Ligand binder design. Structure first.
Ligand SMILES: Oc1cccc(O)c1
Ligand SMILES: Oc1cccc(O)c1
Ligand SMILES: Oc1cccc(O)c1
Ligand SMILES: Oc1cccc(O)c1
Ligand SMILES: Oc1cccc(O)c1
Ligand SMILES: [Cu+2]
Ligand SMILES: [Cu+2]
Lengths: 347, 12, 347, 4
């Protein structure tokens, strides 16, 4: 039976798993979404007249960068208890990744829902971003709004984009980042918690190698790429478990560890799930992870196929949308980007 | 990996 | 219909194509092979007990280096008219690359055979080296003899190996090399006839980017990697033609231009097909070009597959082997390195 | 753009 989110606005508990230092935690663990007594409605495919074209974060136009900053600022300006707010959007990640919900709707109220470290990883984050992007557009009255994506698979895209830097006056800034790494600028997709101290050009080569390993060498079939089968009745898979998919365990994890500030108790913000969403770059990194799924499929290789297991197809999550409606979405319905009315500008 | 020899090796 | 070498001992003319300055040419254009009363026999797969392991030129054991040096010396000690001799082996390149032979056996007696600048590039040179290597081993009675290869895809291997340097007392030496470049040591795989005034570590990065360009970015399918289709009735494809494959037009060409001596009439030795084989490093560079073919398939990327067109499979050449027998070989028979009983020592 |  498929993993099924309950009414997250009626059945939710404080996040208390996967956070090593709760005593000194700098972000809240009260990550439950606002309870507005709304009815959960089924997803309907968008009727957008144009496709939203996500743009490389290092090659944005003035309007792209300006619109994005304005949208994030608007989001930061909302009171937290607005489900579209900066903090509410961050808490979504906390609730789904750090044990806010249980499998009660599947008859297992004794077991948490975890969307990480399994085949739920890609589709959950695809939906998370889908609503996030549409919410941002609505806040600035831009019906064709699109997120940037951090193109760390291309050399010019490997340095963290300057648009995220500066100080608090920049809405895309977050003080809780590894200061030494931000100075280095170039992300280490092979980062394992220890600085390599290698030449920049060698880091580029290392990063190109890492993307190849995650998309081709190790992502050879649906189980190795998406991650292990995870269904109702299953306990949460531990971080670093061998069954975790190639991208999630590889380049994905590396970027989070690299950006997260090691002087913080849980390496907040990016260094832990529960706090990652408080860094705007979280969503932009994840937009490229979302793109990795597209690239993996476009590689017409044996085994590079989508999942057909019903217990994956029928897994579902709940999100607030731009109208503050509650929407249930299914994995099966996000596999086709044309139907979600967005794509990525390549090069 | 790929076309590169141990590019992530800090001790190359 | 496939390109088919004639009886090369019966139908052959002096090289007169692709040599800009024939008047001042420092090597002979009389590149035809010796006639020993042999008849041409079909190839048979070797029954070697062990696989010969080619070694990176910058990391040879004392025995590997001493064996190679002894073998080349023995080849230089042979009179030129021996088909196994240093000069005979060099002339093979001249005859196949500078218009020694015609397509007479295909019914086109007024068109030359050219093995460069098409899909014949990789398999012709694989066979050329296969016999060259087995001849060398025979001259020193080492049944498991293997060539070195110039591993310029790895930083440590990018400097031309010191084994090729010194003076004439070294059999691996050739005076007709770009003296300034030999002093620089680090090959420029992007060399286009103008010295780059850049630091060594940047040249390393340039070289990495070039190997990635040739094997991944531009070698996207058999046509783009191996080069354009070339069959009986086709005229010779020009150097620099758009249809030339990625490795041949790229890193391959750069190394030849870089090592060739610009003070010579045709940039002899490496700077022109007709003279390149007079430099021992020619074969060792080409052994890594041979390895690029292996690497390209091992990448297991989409389109990285061998050619299946019969007009490629059934194309053939004629070489002398270590028994001074004439052997006809076909492209189809060199695609599997296990059956040719050699491979490469990898990291 | 290491090849300049
Ligand atoms: O609403 C805003 C505008 C700019 C920066 C910021 O942190 C919030
Ligand atoms: O395109 C590239 C490939 C490898 C190293 C580098 O600095 C750039
Ligand atoms: O730039 C480098 C340095 C060391 C190994 C490598 O593959 C690339
Ligand atoms: O070679 C494979 C591996 C996995 C799924 C498939 O359809 C093909
Ligand atoms: O056999 C091939 C040749 C070219 C592209 C591809 O995906 C497969
Ligand atoms: Cu997540
Ligand atoms: Cu050649």
């Amino acid at each position: 039976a498929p993993i099924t989110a309950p009414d997250i606005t009626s059945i939710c508990k404080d996040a208390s798993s996967g956070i090593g230092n709760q005593e000194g935690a700098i972000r809240t663990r009260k990550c439950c979404p606002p309870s507005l007594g709304k009815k959960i409605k089924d997803f309907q495919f968008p009727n957008d007249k144009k496709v939203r074209m996500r743009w490389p974060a290092h090659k944005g136009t003035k309007k792209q960068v300006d619109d994005y900053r304005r949208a994030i600022a608007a989001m930061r300006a909302l009171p937290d208890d607005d489900p579209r707010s900066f903090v509410s959007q961050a808490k979504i990640h906390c609730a789904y990744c750090n044990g806010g919900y249980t499998q009660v709707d599947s008859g297992f109220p004794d077991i948490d829902i975890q969307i990480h470290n399994s085949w739920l990883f890609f589709p959950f984050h695809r939906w998370y971003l889908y609503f996030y992007e549409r919410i941002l557009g609505s806040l600035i009255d831009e019906p064709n709004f699109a997120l940037p994506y951090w193109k760390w698979d291309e050399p010019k895209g490997m340095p963290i984009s300057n648009i995220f830097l500066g100080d608090a006056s920049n809405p895309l800034y977050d003080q809780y980042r590894d200061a030494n790494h931000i100075e280095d600028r170039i992300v280490d997709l092979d980062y394992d918690g220890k600085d390599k101290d290698i030449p920049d050009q060698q880091q580029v080569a290392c990063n190109l190698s890492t993307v190849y390993r995650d998309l081709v060498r190790n992502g050879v079939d649906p189980t190795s790429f998406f991650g292990g089968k995870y269904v109702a009745g299953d306990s949460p898979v531990a971080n670093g478990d061998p069954s975790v998919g190639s991208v999630e365990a590889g380049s994905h994890t590396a970027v989070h560890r690299w950006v997260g500030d090691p002087t913080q108790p849980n390496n907040e913000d990016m260094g832990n799930f529960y706090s990652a969403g408080y860094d705007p770059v979280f969503y932009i990194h994840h937009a490229n992870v979302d793109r990795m799924w597209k690239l993996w499929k476009e590689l017409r290789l044996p085994g590079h196929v989508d999942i057909t297991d019903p217990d994956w197809l029928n897994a579902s999550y709940v999100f607030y949308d731009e109208n503050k409606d509650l929407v249930r979405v299914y994995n099966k319905d996000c596999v086709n980007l044309d139907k979600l009315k967005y794509n990525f500008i390549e090069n | 990996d790929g076309v590169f020899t141990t590019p992530c090796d800090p001790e190359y």
